[PDB]
Structure formats: C-alpha cells, structure tokens
RNA sequence: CGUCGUCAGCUCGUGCCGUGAGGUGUUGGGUUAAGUCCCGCAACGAGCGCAACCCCCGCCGUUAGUUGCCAGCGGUUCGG
C-alpha cells in the first residue's frame, strides 16, 4: 500500500529551525535546509500503518487534527472519507481532557439541527431567528468533524505535532496513542507512531493522509479508488 | 432601609497552569449605556448583575357615549 517515490512528493524541509531530537531521521542538509532520510520514513510508515490497520480491523476510532492552512482542507476530505472525526478549524482547549463538557456543546449543535429543520415555533422573534442561526453556523464551523466523536478516540492522527502540541498533550494525559506526520521542527519522542515527513507541502500532506485513509477503508470493510486532491 | 452605585461588575462547574496562595475563563483588538456585542484565545459553558418582560408620556386604531364631548339640523327662557 506504501509507495516509494514520495521523493517526488516531499522528502521534507526546514532549515536549522529544527529540533535536535529529530536528528535520527535526517540524512543530510541541502539548500540550507534539513533533508529527511526517506529510507527511515519507510521503516516508520510500515510500523505506523501496522498500528493503524489493527485499529481499523477492530473498529476503533481515530481523531484527525490539522489546522495549519495547508493540511486544513485535506482533513475534511480525508477524514469524512474514513467516516471518522476531525478538527479542521480551531483546536478547542480541553477536547479530550475535558471531553464531556465540550460534547455538551454538540448536544446544543444537534439541538439546533432539530429545532432549525423547522418548525416547533417560527413564532419566536425575528432577532432570535437571526441569533440562533448565527450560533448554528458557528458550532458548525468548529464542531463539524468533532460530533462523529461520541467517545474518546482510541487514537489520534496529527499533521503538525509542534503546531498541535496541545493536542498531543491532551492525548498523552489520557494514554490515547498519537500518530503524526512531522517535519524536522518536531519533538519525535513525543509521538507514538510517527511519520517523519514534510508537514507543510500539500503534496505530502496529501499522500500521507490519503494512504492512511485508504488503509483505513481497505481493512475496515471495502476497498476504494482515487479520492479528491487539489492540484 | 442607606451607601459605594444603575457603577459593570461578582462568581461557579469542569478543563488547563502553578509545590502553593492563585492564575486561566473575566486578558487581549473593535464596539457598546453596560462582562453590550463582534473577532481572537487553553479553554468550554453556566449563574447572579446588564438588557428585555411591568407602569407613565408621545402617534395611530378598535371597544365603548354618561355625569363627559358639540361638528351640522331644529329649536335656544339667551345656560350644549
Ligand atoms: Mg511546521
Ligand atoms: Mg477553575
Ligand atoms: Mg510560580
Ligand atoms: Mg496540579
Ligand atoms: Mg480557581
Ligand atoms: Mg473580574
Ligand atoms: Mg480573575
Ligand atoms: Mg477588551
Ligand atoms: Mg449602565
Ligand atoms: Mg453578558
Ligand atoms: Mg474570551
């Protein structure tokens, strides 16, 4: 499932703005930039995917987090495709560590879908319609990929662990294992199942997250053919 | 009951940070009469306050016509 010229796709990036624990995943540094050893990326993609597989084939949830503008859209696609939750927009504080309270907000979200499907009163004032609807779009913006989470994920997949340090933090306090793609600006030891690759180029964000979702469906019940990628 | 003070404020739940007192939220940019609302945010909500719901005055309509009103008719002791 794994493919090999991801070299055409990413080979990583970032100049000495690096974290030095990431030393082991580096072949050399080129155009004043850290160049990620793909042979290591391989060793890892395997061991990571093995974990991913077992989790799919036991029907266990993955939380997908990415909000850096680059990996932003491709998590709505790729996660819906896996029929799994994600946070696309802002990563609210305490989503895992204070789950039940955050979710108490999704009941509100549902409750608006129900109320605003119609009618059960449109004899409520004009302002209130406006007010309530504005709220509705709101929850929808952050909470959309979140509602699929009815229980604490059995794992979480993150695009930038540095950028999503809070996320990795919340998981570790819960023992929720962490999967992440991570370029050279990252603390490796902080990840359980790790994908040492460029995390800023959508070429790469694409390949890795897709093949992830692919392995997710392929072992879950079915197989599928190409999914959406912006050029 | 006064007062600060009709001032925009004071807290809480759980989360997070801190050995701890405590912090966060309630800070921050814009806006408002206002913790008023907007956006941003390790917070996410909730409460007592703000506001709204009640009374008065301003415009209009309807229900009413006496003890109140008199526009036109008729009388009119000259006082609807
Ligand atoms: Mg980065
Ligand atoms: Mg607290
Ligand atoms: Mg201290
Ligand atoms: Mg503590
Ligand atoms: Mg406290
Ligand atoms: Mg205060
Ligand atoms: Mg305070
Ligand atoms: Mg302010
Ligand atoms: Mg005031
Ligand atoms: Mg308020
Ligand atoms: Mg705030």
PDB file of N, CA, C and O (backbone and C1' of nucleotides) in Angstrom, chain B residues 32-69:
ATOM      1  P     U B  32     -18.972  52.775  19.823  1.00  0.00           P
ATOM      2  O5'   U B  32     -19.921  52.125  20.917  1.00  0.00           O
ATOM      3  C5'   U B  32     -21.257  51.836  20.570  1.00  0.00           C
ATOM      4  C4'   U B  32     -21.927  50.986  21.602  1.00  0.00           C
ATOM      5  C3'   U B  32     -22.168  51.664  22.930  1.00  0.00           C
ATOM      6  O3'   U B  32     -23.298  52.508  22.890  1.00  0.00           O
ATOM      7  C1'   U B  32     -21.316  49.492  23.291  1.00  0.00           C
ATOM      8  P     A B  33     -23.183  53.983  23.478  1.00  0.00           P
ATOM      9  O5'   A B  33     -23.371  53.750  25.044  1.00  0.00           O
ATOM     10  C5'   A B  33     -23.191  54.794  25.987  1.00  0.00           C
ATOM     11  C4'   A B  33     -23.407  54.274  27.382  1.00  0.00           C
ATOM     12  C3'   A B  33     -22.819  52.883  27.641  1.00  0.00           C
ATOM     13  O3'   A B  33     -21.479  52.932  28.097  1.00  0.00           O
ATOM     14  C1'   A B  33     -25.126  52.899  28.213  1.00  0.00           C
ATOM     15  P     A B  34     -20.399  51.803  27.696  1.00  0.00           P
ATOM     16  O5'   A B  34     -20.894  50.517  28.499  1.00  0.00           O
ATOM     17  C5'   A B  34     -20.689  50.421  29.905  1.00  0.00           C
ATOM     18  C4'   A B  34     -21.339  49.200  30.518  1.00  0.00           C
ATOM     19  C3'   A B  34     -20.968  47.852  29.902  1.00  0.00           C
ATOM     20  O3'   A B  34     -19.835  47.276  30.516  1.00  0.00           O
ATOM     21  C1'   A B  34     -23.324  48.047  30.054  1.00  0.00           C
ATOM     22  P     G B  35     -18.488  47.031  29.684  1.00  0.00           P
ATOM     23  O5'   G B  35     -18.460  45.477  29.342  1.00  0.00           O
ATOM     24  C5'   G B  35     -18.091  44.499  30.315  1.00  0.00           C
ATOM     25  C4'   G B  35     -18.833  43.199  30.098  1.00  0.00           C
ATOM     26  C3'   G B  35     -20.195  43.079  30.796  1.00  0.00           C
ATOM     27  O3'   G B  35     -21.159  42.486  29.922  1.00  0.00           O
ATOM     28  C1'   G B  35     -18.807  41.234  31.364  1.00  0.00           C
ATOM     29  P     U B  36     -22.724  42.858  30.051  1.00  0.00           P
ATOM     30  O5'   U B  36     -23.042  43.438  28.601  1.00  0.00           O
ATOM     31  C5'   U B  36     -24.367  43.741  28.204  1.00  0.00           C
ATOM     32  C4'   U B  36     -24.460  44.017  26.723  1.00  0.00           C
ATOM     33  C3'   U B  36     -23.799  42.995  25.812  1.00  0.00           C
ATOM     34  O3'   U B  36     -24.638  41.869  25.602  1.00  0.00           O
ATOM     35  C1'   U B  36     -23.217  45.189  25.120  1.00  0.00           C
ATOM     36  P     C B  37     -24.043  40.382  25.411  1.00  0.00           P
ATOM     37  O5'   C B  37     -23.462  40.399  23.934  1.00  0.00           O
ATOM     38  C5'   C B  37     -24.332  40.378  22.823  1.00  0.00           C
ATOM     39  C4'   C B  37     -23.678  40.973  21.610  1.00  0.00           C
ATOM     40  C3'   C B  37     -22.463  40.265  21.037  1.00  0.00           C
ATOM     41  O3'   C B  37     -22.744  39.081  20.301  1.00  0.00           O
ATOM     42  C1'   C B  37     -21.997  42.561  21.199  1.00  0.00           C
ATOM     43  P     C B  38     -21.560  38.017  20.003  1.00  0.00           P
ATOM     44  O5'   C B  38     -20.615  38.761  18.959  1.00  0.00           O
ATOM     45  C5'   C B  38     -21.106  39.210  17.702  1.00  0.00           C
ATOM     46  C4'   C B  38     -19.995  39.799  16.884  1.00  0.00           C
ATOM     47  C3'   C B  38     -18.791  38.881  16.772  1.00  0.00           C
ATOM     48  O3'   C B  38     -18.971  37.868  15.797  1.00  0.00           O
ATOM     49  C1'   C B  38     -18.061  41.059  17.374  1.00  0.00           C
ATOM     50  P     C B  39     -18.342  36.406  16.034  1.00  0.00           P
ATOM     51  O5'   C B  39     -16.768  36.678  15.969  1.00  0.00           O
ATOM     52  C5'   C B  39     -16.176  36.968  14.711  1.00  0.00           C
ATOM     53  C4'   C B  39     -14.760  37.466  14.825  1.00  0.00           C
ATOM     54  C3'   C B  39     -13.751  36.544  15.474  1.00  0.00           C
ATOM     55  O3'   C B  39     -13.283  35.538  14.605  1.00  0.00           O
ATOM     56  C1'   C B  39     -13.484  38.712  16.341  1.00  0.00           C
ATOM     57  P     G B  40     -12.697  34.190  15.237  1.00  0.00           P
ATOM     58  O5'   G B  40     -11.457  34.683  16.091  1.00  0.00           O
ATOM     59  C5'   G B  40     -10.221  34.991  15.471  1.00  0.00           C
ATOM     60  C4'   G B  40      -9.185  35.373  16.497  1.00  0.00           C
ATOM     61  C3'   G B  40      -8.849  34.297  17.515  1.00  0.00           C
ATOM     62  O3'   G B  40      -7.919  33.361  17.015  1.00  0.00           O
ATOM     63  C1'   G B  40      -9.154  36.359  18.605  1.00  0.00           C
ATOM     64  P     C B  41      -7.947  31.837  17.518  1.00  0.00           P
ATOM     65  O5'   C B  41      -7.558  31.867  19.058  1.00  0.00           O
ATOM     66  C5'   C B  41      -6.258  32.264  19.468  1.00  0.00           C
ATOM     67  C4'   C B  41      -6.187  32.355  20.964  1.00  0.00           C
ATOM     68  C3'   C B  41      -6.504  31.059  21.690  1.00  0.00           C
ATOM     69  O3'   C B  41      -5.327  30.270  21.832  1.00  0.00           O
ATOM     70  C1'   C B  41      -7.733  32.871  22.658  1.00  0.00           C
ATOM     71  P     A B  42      -5.318  28.670  21.636  1.00  0.00           P
ATOM     72  O5'   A B  42      -5.827  28.153  23.053  1.00  0.00           O
ATOM     73  C5'   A B  42      -5.139  28.448  24.268  1.00  0.00           C
ATOM     74  C4'   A B  42      -6.086  28.315  25.435  1.00  0.00           C
ATOM     75  C3'   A B  42      -5.606  28.798  26.809  1.00  0.00           C
ATOM     76  O3'   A B  42      -6.662  29.432  27.526  1.00  0.00           O
ATOM     77  C1'   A B  42      -6.382  26.577  26.941  1.00  0.00           C
ATOM     78  P     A B  43      -7.170  30.886  27.128  1.00  0.00           P
ATOM     79  O5'   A B  43      -8.280  30.588  26.004  1.00  0.00           O
ATOM     80  C5'   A B  43      -9.618  30.176  26.329  1.00  0.00           C
ATOM     81  C4'   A B  43      -9.913  28.726  25.970  1.00  0.00           C
ATOM     82  C3'   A B  43     -11.402  28.369  25.868  1.00  0.00           C
ATOM     83  O3'   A B  43     -11.911  28.533  24.559  1.00  0.00           O
ATOM     84  C1'   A B  43     -10.379  26.950  27.436  1.00  0.00           C
ATOM     85  P     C B  44     -13.362  29.198  24.319  1.00  0.00           P
ATOM     86  O5'   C B  44     -14.386  28.031  24.653  1.00  0.00           O
ATOM     87  C5'   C B  44     -14.295  26.734  24.091  1.00  0.00           C
ATOM     88  C4'   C B  44     -15.299  25.854  24.769  1.00  0.00           C
ATOM     89  C3'   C B  44     -16.582  26.566  25.205  1.00  0.00           C
ATOM     90  O3'   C B  44     -17.524  26.783  24.166  1.00  0.00           O
ATOM     91  C1'   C B  44     -15.732  25.305  27.021  1.00  0.00           C
ATOM     92  P     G B  45     -18.733  27.856  24.321  1.00  0.00           P
ATOM     93  O5'   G B  45     -19.664  27.135  25.376  1.00  0.00           O
ATOM     94  C5'   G B  45     -20.607  27.836  26.140  1.00  0.00           C
ATOM     95  C4'   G B  45     -21.030  26.952  27.271  1.00  0.00           C
ATOM     96  C3'   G B  45     -21.879  27.622  28.329  1.00  0.00           C
ATOM     97  O3'   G B  45     -23.244  27.667  27.985  1.00  0.00           O
ATOM     98  C1'   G B  45     -20.079  26.523  29.375  1.00  0.00           C
ATOM     99  P     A B  46     -24.068  29.031  28.219  1.00  0.00           P
ATOM    100  O5'   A B  46     -24.523  28.898  29.736  1.00  0.00           O
ATOM    101  C5'   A B  46     -24.938  27.644  30.248  1.00  0.00           C
ATOM    102  C4'   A B  46     -24.833  27.614  31.746  1.00  0.00           C
ATOM    103  C3'   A B  46     -25.264  28.887  32.464  1.00  0.00           C
ATOM    104  O3'   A B  46     -26.665  29.030  32.581  1.00  0.00           O
ATOM    105  C1'   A B  46     -23.194  28.176  33.340  1.00  0.00           C
ATOM    106  P     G B  47     -27.358  30.486  32.597  1.00  0.00           P
ATOM    107  O5'   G B  47     -27.056  31.003  34.082  1.00  0.00           O
ATOM    108  C5'   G B  47     -27.614  30.323  35.197  1.00  0.00           C
ATOM    109  C4'   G B  47     -27.061  30.800  36.521  1.00  0.00           C
ATOM    110  C3'   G B  47     -27.301  32.255  36.899  1.00  0.00           C
ATOM    111  O3'   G B  47     -28.620  32.492  37.362  1.00  0.00           O
ATOM    112  C1'   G B  47     -25.056  31.692  37.366  1.00  0.00           C
ATOM    113  P     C B  48     -29.411  33.830  36.933  1.00  0.00           P
ATOM    114  O5'   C B  48     -29.072  34.890  38.065  1.00  0.00           O
ATOM    115  C5'   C B  48     -29.142  34.548  39.440  1.00  0.00           C
ATOM    116  C4'   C B  48     -28.281  35.482  40.249  1.00  0.00           C
ATOM    117  C3'   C B  48     -28.442  36.952  39.918  1.00  0.00           C
ATOM    118  O3'   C B  48     -29.592  37.537  40.504  1.00  0.00           O
ATOM    119  C1'   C B  48     -26.145  36.427  39.961  1.00  0.00           C
ATOM    120  P     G B  49     -30.323  38.751  39.753  1.00  0.00           P
ATOM    121  O5'   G B  49     -29.157  39.788  39.526  1.00  0.00           O
ATOM    122  C5'   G B  49     -29.202  40.737  38.487  1.00  0.00           C
ATOM    123  C4'   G B  49     -27.972  41.599  38.531  1.00  0.00           C
ATOM    124  C3'   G B  49     -27.904  42.689  37.486  1.00  0.00           C
ATOM    125  O3'   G B  49     -28.693  43.817  37.834  1.00  0.00           O
ATOM    126  C1'   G B  49     -25.832  41.557  37.547  1.00  0.00           C
ATOM    127  P     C B  50     -29.548  44.589  36.702  1.00  0.00           P
ATOM    128  O5'   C B  50     -28.552  44.644  35.463  1.00  0.00           O
ATOM    129  C5'   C B  50     -27.693  45.754  35.317  1.00  0.00           C
ATOM    130  C4'   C B  50     -27.194  45.870  33.917  1.00  0.00           C
ATOM    131  C3'   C B  50     -28.255  46.083  32.857  1.00  0.00           C
ATOM    132  O3'   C B  50     -28.724  47.423  32.780  1.00  0.00           O
ATOM    133  C1'   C B  50     -26.716  44.434  32.147  1.00  0.00           C
ATOM    134  P     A B  51     -30.309  47.662  32.920  1.00  0.00           P
ATOM    135  O5'   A B  51     -30.875  47.076  31.545  1.00  0.00           O
ATOM    136  C5'   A B  51     -30.459  47.626  30.303  1.00  0.00           C
ATOM    137  C4'   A B  51     -30.620  46.642  29.160  1.00  0.00           C
ATOM    138  C3'   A B  51     -32.022  46.133  28.863  1.00  0.00           C
ATOM    139  O3'   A B  51     -32.771  47.038  28.080  1.00  0.00           O
ATOM    140  C1'   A B  51     -30.562  44.302  28.964  1.00  0.00           C
ATOM    141  P     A B  52     -34.193  47.557  28.609  1.00  0.00           P
ATOM    142  O5'   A B  52     -35.212  46.404  28.186  1.00  0.00           O
ATOM    143  C5'   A B  52     -35.203  45.887  26.860  1.00  0.00           C
ATOM    144  C4'   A B  52     -35.897  44.552  26.759  1.00  0.00           C
ATOM    145  C3'   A B  52     -37.199  44.375  27.542  1.00  0.00           C
ATOM    146  O3'   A B  52     -38.343  44.924  26.895  1.00  0.00           O
ATOM    147  C1'   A B  52     -35.779  42.553  27.978  1.00  0.00           C
ATOM    148  P     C B  53     -39.473  45.715  27.735  1.00  0.00           P
ATOM    149  O5'   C B  53     -40.453  44.597  28.327  1.00  0.00           O
ATOM    150  C5'   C B  53     -41.020  43.562  27.529  1.00  0.00           C
ATOM    151  C4'   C B  53     -41.531  42.432  28.390  1.00  0.00           C
ATOM    152  C3'   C B  53     -42.372  42.841  29.606  1.00  0.00           C
ATOM    153  O3'   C B  53     -43.771  42.971  29.306  1.00  0.00           O
ATOM    154  C1'   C B  53     -40.619  41.363  30.285  1.00  0.00           C
ATOM    155  P     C B  54     -44.529  44.365  28.945  1.00  0.00           P
ATOM    156  O5'   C B  54     -45.027  44.896  30.359  1.00  0.00           O
ATOM    157  C5'   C B  54     -45.704  44.050  31.281  1.00  0.00           C
ATOM    158  C4'   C B  54     -45.815  44.708  32.637  1.00  0.00           C
ATOM    159  C3'   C B  54     -46.087  46.204  32.604  1.00  0.00           C
ATOM    160  O3'   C B  54     -47.425  46.568  32.391  1.00  0.00           O
ATOM    161  C1'   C B  54     -44.257  45.822  34.012  1.00  0.00           C
ATOM    162  P     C B  55     -47.716  47.809  31.418  1.00  0.00           P
ATOM    163  O5'   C B  55     -47.673  49.064  32.388  1.00  0.00           O
ATOM    164  C5'   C B  55     -48.405  49.036  33.607  1.00  0.00           C
ATOM    165  C4'   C B  55     -48.101  50.256  34.423  1.00  0.00           C
ATOM    166  C3'   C B  55     -48.150  51.532  33.605  1.00  0.00           C
ATOM    167  O3'   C B  55     -49.453  52.040  33.381  1.00  0.00           O
ATOM    168  C1'   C B  55     -46.147  51.496  34.830  1.00  0.00           C
ATOM    169  P     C B  56     -49.818  52.642  31.930  1.00  0.00           P
ATOM    170  O5'   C B  56     -49.420  54.191  32.038  1.00  0.00           O
ATOM    171  C5'   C B  56     -49.422  54.877  33.299  1.00  0.00           C
ATOM    172  C4'   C B  56     -48.540  56.118  33.297  1.00  0.00           C
ATOM    173  C3'   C B  56     -48.544  56.950  32.019  1.00  0.00           C
ATOM    174  O3'   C B  56     -49.699  57.772  31.894  1.00  0.00           O
ATOM    175  C1'   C B  56     -46.313  56.659  32.740  1.00  0.00           C
ATOM    176  P     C B  57     -50.414  57.969  30.465  1.00  0.00           P
ATOM    177  O5'   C B  57     -49.502  59.040  29.682  1.00  0.00           O
ATOM    178  C5'   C B  57     -49.101  60.288  30.258  1.00  0.00           C
ATOM    179  C4'   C B  57     -47.943  60.910  29.496  1.00  0.00           C
ATOM    180  C3'   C B  57     -48.101  61.011  27.980  1.00  0.00           C
ATOM    181  O3'   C B  57     -48.881  62.111  27.525  1.00  0.00           O
ATOM    182  C1'   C B  57     -45.949  60.154  28.496  1.00  0.00           C
ATOM    183  P     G B  58     -49.808  61.906  26.223  1.00  0.00           P
ATOM    184  O5'   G B  58     -48.759  61.714  25.046  1.00  0.00           O
ATOM    185  C5'   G B  58     -48.137  62.850  24.490  1.00  0.00           C
ATOM    186  C4'   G B  58     -47.252  62.510  23.322  1.00  0.00           C
ATOM    187  C3'   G B  58     -47.869  61.769  22.161  1.00  0.00           C
ATOM    188  O3'   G B  58     -48.647  62.604  21.331  1.00  0.00           O
ATOM    189  C1'   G B  58     -45.772  60.814  22.660  1.00  0.00           C
ATOM    190  P     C B  59     -50.172  62.205  20.951  1.00  0.00           P
ATOM    191  O5'   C B  59     -49.960  61.453  19.568  1.00  0.00           O
ATOM    192  C5'   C B  59     -49.323  62.092  18.469  1.00  0.00           C
ATOM    193  C4'   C B  59     -49.183  61.117  17.332  1.00  0.00           C
ATOM    194  C3'   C B  59     -50.446  60.320  17.065  1.00  0.00           C
ATOM    195  O3'   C B  59     -51.408  61.011  16.291  1.00  0.00           O
ATOM    196  C1'   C B  59     -48.667  58.822  17.337  1.00  0.00           C
ATOM    197  P     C B  60     -52.945  60.993  16.779  1.00  0.00           P
ATOM    198  O5'   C B  60     -53.521  59.636  16.109  1.00  0.00           O
ATOM    199  C5'   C B  60     -53.222  59.321  14.740  1.00  0.00           C
ATOM    200  C4'   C B  60     -53.203  57.837  14.397  1.00  0.00           C
ATOM    201  C3'   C B  60     -54.411  56.979  14.770  1.00  0.00           C
ATOM    202  O3'   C B  60     -55.550  57.153  13.946  1.00  0.00           O
ATOM    203  C1'   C B  60     -52.471  55.846  15.408  1.00  0.00           C
ATOM    204  P     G B  61     -57.004  57.239  14.638  1.00  0.00           P
ATOM    205  O5'   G B  61     -57.584  55.754  14.546  1.00  0.00           O
ATOM    206  C5'   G B  61     -57.462  54.964  13.376  1.00  0.00           C
ATOM    207  C4'   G B  61     -57.451  53.496  13.729  1.00  0.00           C
ATOM    208  C3'   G B  61     -58.618  52.960  14.565  1.00  0.00           C
ATOM    209  O3'   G B  61     -59.812  52.721  13.817  1.00  0.00           O
ATOM    210  C1'   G B  61     -56.581  52.215  15.509  1.00  0.00           C
ATOM    211  P     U B  62     -61.281  53.145  14.370  1.00  0.00           P
ATOM    212  O5'   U B  62     -61.772  51.889  15.233  1.00  0.00           O
ATOM    213  C5'   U B  62     -61.775  50.572  14.693  1.00  0.00           C
ATOM    214  C4'   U B  62     -61.676  49.520  15.775  1.00  0.00           C
ATOM    215  C3'   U B  62     -62.743  49.556  16.875  1.00  0.00           C
ATOM    216  O3'   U B  62     -63.966  48.924  16.479  1.00  0.00           O
ATOM    217  C1'   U B  62     -60.576  49.361  17.859  1.00  0.00           C
ATOM    218  P     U B  63     -65.432  49.449  16.958  1.00  0.00           P
ATOM    219  O5'   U B  63     -65.493  49.041  18.500  1.00  0.00           O
ATOM    220  C5'   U B  63     -65.277  47.693  18.908  1.00  0.00           C
ATOM    221  C4'   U B  63     -65.373  47.577  20.403  1.00  0.00           C
ATOM    222  C3'   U B  63     -66.439  48.476  21.016  1.00  0.00           C
ATOM    223  O3'   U B  63     -67.736  47.919  20.945  1.00  0.00           O
ATOM    224  C1'   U B  63     -64.410  48.758  22.209  1.00  0.00           C
ATOM    225  P     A B  64     -68.942  48.794  20.342  1.00  0.00           P
ATOM    226  O5'   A B  64     -69.718  49.268  21.667  1.00  0.00           O
ATOM    227  C5'   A B  64     -69.817  50.637  22.032  1.00  0.00           C
ATOM    228  C4'   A B  64     -69.286  50.909  23.427  1.00  0.00           C
ATOM    229  C3'   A B  64     -69.704  52.263  23.998  1.00  0.00           C
ATOM    230  O3'   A B  64     -71.012  52.261  24.563  1.00  0.00           O
ATOM    231  C1'   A B  64     -67.368  51.938  24.327  1.00  0.00           C
ATOM    232  P     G B  65     -72.209  53.025  23.805  1.00  0.00           P
ATOM    233  O5'   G B  65     -72.276  54.479  24.438  1.00  0.00           O
ATOM    234  C5'   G B  65     -72.633  54.715  25.797  1.00  0.00           C
ATOM    235  C4'   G B  65     -72.541  56.194  26.091  1.00  0.00           C
ATOM    236  C3'   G B  65     -73.469  57.059  25.226  1.00  0.00           C
ATOM    237  O3'   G B  65     -73.871  58.242  25.913  1.00  0.00           O
ATOM    238  C1'   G B  65     -71.226  57.656  24.798  1.00  0.00           C
ATOM    239  P     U B  66     -75.068  58.222  26.980  1.00  0.00           P
ATOM    240  O5'   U B  66     -74.511  57.345  28.191  1.00  0.00           O
ATOM    241  C5'   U B  66     -75.246  57.202  29.405  1.00  0.00           C
ATOM    242  C4'   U B  66     -74.781  58.092  30.551  1.00  0.00           C
ATOM    243  C3'   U B  66     -75.189  59.566  30.546  1.00  0.00           C
ATOM    244  O3'   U B  66     -75.382  59.935  31.914  1.00  0.00           O
ATOM    245  C1'   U B  66     -72.828  59.426  30.614  1.00  0.00           C
ATOM    246  P     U B  67     -76.156  61.280  32.347  1.00  0.00           P
ATOM    247  O5'   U B  67     -74.959  62.161  32.912  1.00  0.00           O
ATOM    248  C5'   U B  67     -75.159  63.414  33.560  1.00  0.00           C
ATOM    249  C4'   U B  67     -73.841  63.956  34.061  1.00  0.00           C
ATOM    250  C3'   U B  67     -72.673  63.882  33.087  1.00  0.00           C
ATOM    251  O3'   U B  67     -71.783  64.947  33.410  1.00  0.00           O
ATOM    252  C1'   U B  67     -72.210  62.509  34.948  1.00  0.00           C
ATOM    253  P     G B  68     -71.787  66.286  32.524  1.00  0.00           P
ATOM    254  O5'   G B  68     -70.459  66.134  31.633  1.00  0.00           O
ATOM    255  C5'   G B  68     -69.139  66.160  32.171  1.00  0.00           C
ATOM    256  C4'   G B  68     -68.171  65.706  31.110  1.00  0.00           C
ATOM    257  C3'   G B  68     -68.428  66.293  29.721  1.00  0.00           C
ATOM    258  O3'   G B  68     -67.809  67.550  29.513  1.00  0.00           O
ATOM    259  C1'   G B  68     -68.273  63.924  29.567  1.00  0.00           C
ATOM    260  P     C B  69     -68.588  68.719  28.738  1.00  0.00           P
ATOM    261  O5'   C B  69     -68.237  68.438  27.199  1.00  0.00           O
ATOM    262  C5'   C B  69     -66.940  67.999  26.845  1.00  0.00           C
ATOM    263  C4'   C B  69     -66.843  67.553  25.408  1.00  0.00           C
ATOM    264  C3'   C B  69     -67.694  68.290  24.390  1.00  0.00           C
ATOM    265  O3'   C B  69     -67.061  69.468  23.954  1.00  0.00           O
ATOM    266  C1'   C B  69     -67.939  65.975  24.075  1.00  0.00           C
TER     267        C B  69
END
